[model samples]
Target: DVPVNLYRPNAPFIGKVISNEPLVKEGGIGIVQHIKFDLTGGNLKYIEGQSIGIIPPGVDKNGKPEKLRLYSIASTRHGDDVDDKTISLCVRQLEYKHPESGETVYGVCSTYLTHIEPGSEVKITGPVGKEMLLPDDPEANVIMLAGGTGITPMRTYLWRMFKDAERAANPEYQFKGFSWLVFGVPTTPNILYKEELEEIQQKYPDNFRLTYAISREQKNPQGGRMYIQDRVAEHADELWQLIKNQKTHTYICGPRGMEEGIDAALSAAAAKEGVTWSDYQKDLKKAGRWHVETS
Candidate 1:
């Protein structure tokens, strides 16, 4: 296998920015950028579901170097070009109002990365993480649940599974089973990678399923915003049936807050068959059939 996690803090790789483009549409919620770096001559290697550490320029309050922040890898191991010489990330600049000052505060690394110019140098380290690795089974059913930028890794997964270019590149892997993505966003505009996703759905209607939960424009049963859990509950029985199959592997990625609601919805569904969702989920975990990568 290619060496992963080869670069570290002590000796980092300086990669040039290939491109940095906005993923969110005009009038969308927040600023999310899809940043790619040229790793043509670099030793760093990574697979899908891994993350890399970005060390922002400058110092902290105590005059110390800015610590690295981990961002999920948004491209396949072969990268977007089907070449193993690049890596990409989907990053959202974290902006929030301070509780006491009531002034806006932006995350240091996120802000730096968002405004970074193309051709600029970045201190990149590690192809870390194994928790979200894709299974080796080409015929396994993949049920993906993503919220907002959590769609990063899911994008990699989808590309690997559905992209014709990707299929041609990876001779050893050819996805022949079903794949479903239930993605949640605040609005239609906030749906990152919207066009690419729809295109794949259009092309592979038989093997791929795409579901979106647009909170602002859509409504749940109670007339509230249609969150991801609401979508999960709406199709709980169907999802439950899919989950029970031994060939299925489920992946959940997003905010920590979304977990509880998802569990609650699935629990209700599992109860219909006198099975506890948590217990069943535990079995899936032990069997490596369930994977979760949340913030």
Candidate 2:
């Protein structure tokens, strides 16, 4: 097992900058640029439905300060919140130079994270934000909606659902709730971690499902474009049933409009099910059956 002691936040992780060399692909930044971090050590931890913020380095034109963009961690507390005591994530790169000052305004944290070689130093903080954490209820069913890099938490939740080691260690509960991911990307090929997602459902088909929609990809033989909202509508029946069965929780991560479209489709289908559109939305939000993401 990987050592958990090294990453206890606010420990030695402070002033540490670690590097992650991304695999070079077409159109990718390709070169791993260097960034810095204020490591929190393992001091901070978060859940599947939560997100974190990083203070980006440097100030803007007005001499205003800008910080790193927060991202969702793709890992749950290894087993339980207290015992596992660690979190992980998949961060994308956003690096560039500010033309005004002729100085580079690198990404707050990830720039440092992505470019630094392993075992280097970085800066980070305790988890921040409440929107993306895993719920406390053990029996809640989850529907993960995401596009682009929003997959951070979606992947995080899925990993926890299928993590056998964690399950074995804590046998009191089983991740039995149903889950589906309707993700949007530029093209089907842009679906990151494709194989990993497939494996989660394959190992536990009853609880985990995934749908990938490419905004730029051509229609399938079925004669339709692939988009996150469409992915859910395509499986409206399953979605409907899941909404009614057990406690349904729908989570969306992508663009600001993603939630609007998903709500429209869900409200329409919910109406067809005789669920008052208002009631459905109200109940979903109240009962934790709905979710959205933006940063």
Question: How large is the C-alpha RMSD of every model relative to the true structure?
Answer: 1.2, 5.7
lDDT of 2: 0.61
Query: TM-scores of all models?
Result: 0.97, 0.76
Give the per-residue lDDT digits (tens) of candidate 2, residues 1-295: 2112333233323444333434324553323322323234345434555654545456756897654456665556552232554445566666567767867665545664564566654444445555565664657788778877778677667767666766775566567777778777766456666777888878888777777887666564467777777776677667777777656677777667777666676677778768866676676666655666765
Per-residue accuracy of model 1 over 2-120 as CA lDDT, tens digit each: 34678998889999999999999997999999999999777788888888999998999899999899999999988898888899999999999977695888999999999999999
The prediction achieving the highest TM-score against the true structure is 1
Model 1 lDDT vs. the true structure?
0.91
**Candidate 1 Cα misplacement greater than 4 A, ranges:** 100-102
Query: Considering only N, C-alpha and C atoms within 3 Å, which residue pairs clash in candidate 1?
Result: none
